[PDB]
Amino acid sequence: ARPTVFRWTGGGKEVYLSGSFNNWSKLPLTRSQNNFVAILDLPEGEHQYKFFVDGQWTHDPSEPIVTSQLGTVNNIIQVKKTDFEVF
Template structure:
């Protein structure tokens, strides 16, 4: 069963060893920002483990511990099949109220249109979407067919430039891995 191990105590090189592999091999943890992680497939049961940080065996003070028969203290993890049962987890989730709806009364009745009330109009466009890359000038030393890298909020939106010389220009920018592709459509009006 896949079990996640996490070390938050710093260090340069972090490994893990335990009773699950008879303490023979040290499994490396991968650094992610300030913490270290690894996923180990463990059989069901109770397993003792310790972290090997920069040449020293260390137990995690935030996790449960157990004394072994030679007098040292190790962390312990209990792996159960029931922890991985999807339907039970879904049932537990459905018992909690996570609707996020504010309290109050709801109905299917359409409200009566109010007369004499001034409607302010549609909401304003968020300021991030006003930075259209098609309207920006490229620096003189750059290839004119290359556009600057777009902001992440500009992706997957359809932009329409104002009509000039009887031509409407539509654009959309999409990302594929580290590449950005901007598609332009020219429509004569």
């Protein structure tokens, strides 16, 4: 598993990260310089995720997206051979 950085740049007061890698629970993100951020160790390969921003499910329009089998929009990224890549 490689350290991987998630960064929400869309603002807000309170932000959670939800994705396949935490079974779609809600991880509190840390405010840092107008970002909200978290760092997770993730195995190489695909992950889907989304944000929960002041009470509302939101994706990041600047990362790739896909429609899930539930019929919802997630971000989709590919963890590769780099430590602390920012998504």
